[PDB]
Structure formats: C-alpha cells, structure tokens
Design a binder for this molecule. Sequence first.
Ligand SMILES: Nc1ncnc2c1ncn2[C@@H]1O[C@H](COP(=O)(O)OP(=O)(O)OP(=O)(O)O)[C@@H](O)[C@H]1O
Ligand SMILES: Nc1nc2c(ncn2[C@@H]2O[C@H](COP(=O)(O)OP(=O)(O)O)[C@@H](O)[C@H]2O)c(=O)[nH]1
Ligand SMILES: [Mg+2]
Lengths: 349, 192
Amino acid sequence: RTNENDPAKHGDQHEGQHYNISPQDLETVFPHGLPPRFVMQVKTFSEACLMVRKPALELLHYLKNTSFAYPAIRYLLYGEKGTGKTLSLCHVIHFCAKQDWLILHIPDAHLWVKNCRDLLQSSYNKQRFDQPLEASTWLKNFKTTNERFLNQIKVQEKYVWNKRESTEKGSPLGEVVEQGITRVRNATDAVGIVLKELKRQSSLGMFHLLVAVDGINALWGRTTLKREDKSPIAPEELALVHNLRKMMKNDWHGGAIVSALSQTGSLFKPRKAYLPQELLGKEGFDALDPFIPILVSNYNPKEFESCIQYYLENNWLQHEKAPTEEGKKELLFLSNANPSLLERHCAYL
Amino acid sequence: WLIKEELEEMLVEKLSDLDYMQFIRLLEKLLTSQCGAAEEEFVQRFRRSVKQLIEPVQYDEQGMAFSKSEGKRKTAKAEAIVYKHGSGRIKVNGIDYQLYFPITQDREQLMFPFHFVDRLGKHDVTCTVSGGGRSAQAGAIRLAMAKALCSFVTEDEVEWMRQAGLLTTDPRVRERKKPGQEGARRKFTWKK
Ligand SMILES: Nc1ncnc2c1ncn2[C@@H]1O[C@H](COP(=O)(O)OP(=O)(O)OP(=O)(O)O)[C@@H](O)[C@H]1O
Ligand SMILES: Nc1nc2c(ncn2[C@@H]2O[C@H](COP(=O)(O)OP(=O)(O)O)[C@@H](O)[C@H]2O)c(=O)[nH]1
Ligand SMILES: [Mg+2]
C-alpha cells in the first residue's frame, strides 16, 4: 500500500507495494480487458489496487524513455500462466491513459478467433469475414475509453458504408465509431477504419498511440471457426485479425505496440507453453521480430508478503489460521508464489 | 509360548487344543510362581523368541548434502532427491511442482510431509515419477519425499511421521477382474 497513486512517479522505491485505481479511472480506462477474477475482486473489495512489480516498472521505464521519432517499438510480456501479464499490461495502460495517450486496447485477441455465432462476409473485401458482435463490443469499449480524443480526431479519407451512405474527409472519428456501433453490420469496417486512421495519424504527431493487445499470439495462430462448408478459417481471413496484424507492424511511429502473451484461451497450444516462440509460432515470431520480451515471474517473497497483507487488511482471508506464519507458509507452498493460484486459493480460504 | 505344533514336535505325540491350553496354563502358573533359575532353566525350553531404515546422506559434486529415496503408489514409481538446504523448490520431472500438479489435492499431498515436520521452505526436492495417474504419482512422490527427508529429520520426528502414516507404502492396488462378473466385486445382475 502506497500513498502514491500517480502511475508516472512510482518506481523501484514502490516495488512490491500497492497502487490504487480510482473508480472513475476504472470505469473510463478499463471498461474491458481486466481479468474476470480481478474484476470480481474489485467489485467485492470496492477497491482496485495493483501491486507494482518489476515487469510493469521496466515497461514504464521504457515507455518514459521512448523516442516517438523512432518507429514504434514492440514489447511482449511473457510468463507462466497466471503470473500477472494481463495486470502488468493494464498497469501500463493506466499509466498511458493518465499521460493522455490514445489507448487502443484489445482485451483478449483470443475471443476474436473462436466461438463466433455471427460470421458474415465482409462487403469491403469478399475474401474476408466479419465478426459484427465482437467488433461492435470493442467499438463501444473504445468509445468509452477514448471519447475525449474521439471528437478531436478527424478522418482523412472518404469511407463508404452502403451504396449510398458515406463519411467525408474532415469528419470526426466519433462519426465512424457511432456508425459502427449503431449499424452492427458495419462494425468490422468501422474497426478497420479506426485502426487505419489511428495508425496514420500517430505519425503526424496528433497524439501518442498505445496499441495494448492481450493474447497477441492469437493473431498468427490457428482458429476454431469453420466456414458454412465446415472448412477451417485461418486468422488472415478475419477482417478484424487482418487489421490488427497490420496495426502490429512497427512501420509507423508515434506510439508503442505493447502486447501480452496468454496461453489461457489459446487454441491448439499445450498447457505448459509460455515462451515467446512456443506461443507465437514461426509466423508470429517473424511478424513481431524485432521485439523486447519482458518476463513476468511469480511473486518474490516480498511481493507475496505484500499481497497476503493486502488480503488480510481487506479481511478476505477469513480462515482463523490464515494470519499465522504456518498458514502463510502453506499458502506460499500451495501457490508457489503464483499470483493467480494464490488469489484463487484465498478466494475461498 | 511355543505353538501346539511345536509342542507336538517336541513330545513326538499328537495333542489336542484343550491339552495344549491346559499345559500352557500350567506353565503360566509356574512362571507367575516366582520361578527361580532352577525352574527357569526348565521353563525356557518352551519359550520361543520373537523403525524406519534411515538412508545414508550423500554429497553432490558441489559438496551439498542430500538424500535419495524411492516410493511406489499403485503403478506410479517416484525417485526423490531431497537436499539438506533449500528454498522449498520442488522440481518434478524437471518441471515445477505447481505446473506438474495443477491439482490442489496433489499439491497438498506434496506439502503434507514437509508441513508435518515443520520444514516448509527448508528443503529442495528433485523428483522423477513414472507411471500411474496424477493422484498415484502425487502419492508416490509424497512417500519418496518423506523417506528422503527421514535422513534429515531426527529419530523422534521420523517415528512421528511413521505414526502419521507418511512412510507406509500403500498396498491398495487395483483388484483384478474375475470371470463371470462385471468387475472385481460387481456381480452380473441376478435374474431370479
Ligand atoms: N501485479 C498484480 N497486482 C495485483 N494482483 C495481481 C497482479 N498480478 C496478478 N495478480 C492477481 O492475479 C490475478 C490476475 O492474474 P493475471 O491475469 O495478471 O495473470 P496472467 O498470467 O496475465 O493471466 P493468464 O492466465 O491469462 O495468462 C488476479 O487475481 C490478481 O489479483
Ligand atoms: N466500409 C469501409 N471500410 C473501410 C474504408 N476504408 C477503410 N475501411 C476499413 O479498412 C479496410 C481497408 O483498409 P485499407 O487501408 O484500404 O487496406 P486493405 O484492407 O489492404 O485494402 C476495410 O476492410 C474496412 O474494414 C471505407 O472507405 N469504407
Ligand atoms: Mg492474461
């Protein structure tokens, strides 16, 4: 627990100590992407406190020392399951949002490559498929996150929606987002246009872009979507995945491509796969290369003690033996300091 | 007291259960009746005489002391090496235990020996388990770890572990199916 709540001042001095997120910042920056279990914890405790950890600190250091003139750099958070990749990414997202970046946050790229009831065919390119439900959901979340810059950003082309309806150069990107959200059939096209506009305008200095993608390994992997002919669909055929792939290139500048691997929710990957190549594959590693991999490891003893103390202060560990040294040692052994396992065990302990 | 068969062998005669009991009662009366050497020399002609094996502590190349043990549960066989000093790390088949045994029950079984002797976080373990399922492997590793740790705990602690059942090889194994019935004990539905 730190009195410091600004995501720009905390450093190694605050390592292993907590960092608060105000309710307004949680409702604005994080309408999506927070872990479901962390969301449940936030609702229960009424507080959103993230432990500051070396991965987040290092990625913040890189982002603060970044040179926007240089091409946008790719950072890839990798680590064993439940080590904290998603929450470190969320910490960096909060830092950038407080620094007034435009946050293009994909909460889980895995959702876009599986379990899709509505898989239409794109009208812009008949060889690609649309995912209207996911596109509209992400557009709503993006509008909520970046409404402030949404009216200040203008488009720089003509975008035809129907054979008659169109959006004109100089119109706010809010018009594009609203069209996508309201007309669910144009959601994927709105997402593509938004990605293109943000990528092009980040180079002009209009703002600084943070492309924060969780489960990035889903783009260049396989998919569990079948055509009407019971034919498998590779990711490139999906309009959303193709546009996000284009976004993931460092050809542009004026921002950073932060991403996090996630075996959880992946397809055709073994449970114990966590390394960058193991999770990305040849295509994914080729696309991301060069990139800076950042290791997210289990809690060190100081972090474990801090998290246990946080739960005890919240009275979450209702078991009478939890505060004891023996109980702490038992928790440490059972979870092997793994954040997710420790949280899950304390959820019922 | 020698058995009726032994007494018969001595007497080159066939006895009965009640005869043997009578003789044993008489001998017990003799024993109770402050039998001295003159009597004990006779009595002893009819008397018949009736802890964990700590492993040696070995040393690795780097001079660190450890103990090696093995344990089998069902079809699972585990070889466990426990080092005298460590930070509680347990590497099973080269994988961290929380990854090899994603099941809380199996992790608890791994914990049970060390937690019992109050040595959590004091020992490093390298285990290799083959055969069986997850639970059989966890039990075999638990037995091997307990046996290895016996070399590093005191004799009283070793006896306490034995009394807690941490050093007994579970003899419960799958019972063979029998012909004419559904399973080991399940019988085919009777048709009156
Ligand atoms: N830095 C952190 N601060 C606070 N809680 C954390 C932190 N990292 C992990 N946790 C806890 O762990 C859970 C979130 O784990 P998280 O999603 O970060 O892991 P992950 O490895 O990214 O997930 P996945 O299993 O999808 O890879 C929550 O219960 C949360 O409280
Ligand atoms: N409907 C519509 N979508 C557009 C338009 N311009 C860009 N897009 C979106 O972005 C994609 C096209 O991106 P573009 O930069 O032209 O590259 P391309 O996909 O290689 O042709 C489309 O599939 C849409 O999702 C436009 O004028 N109308
Ligand atoms: Mg995650």
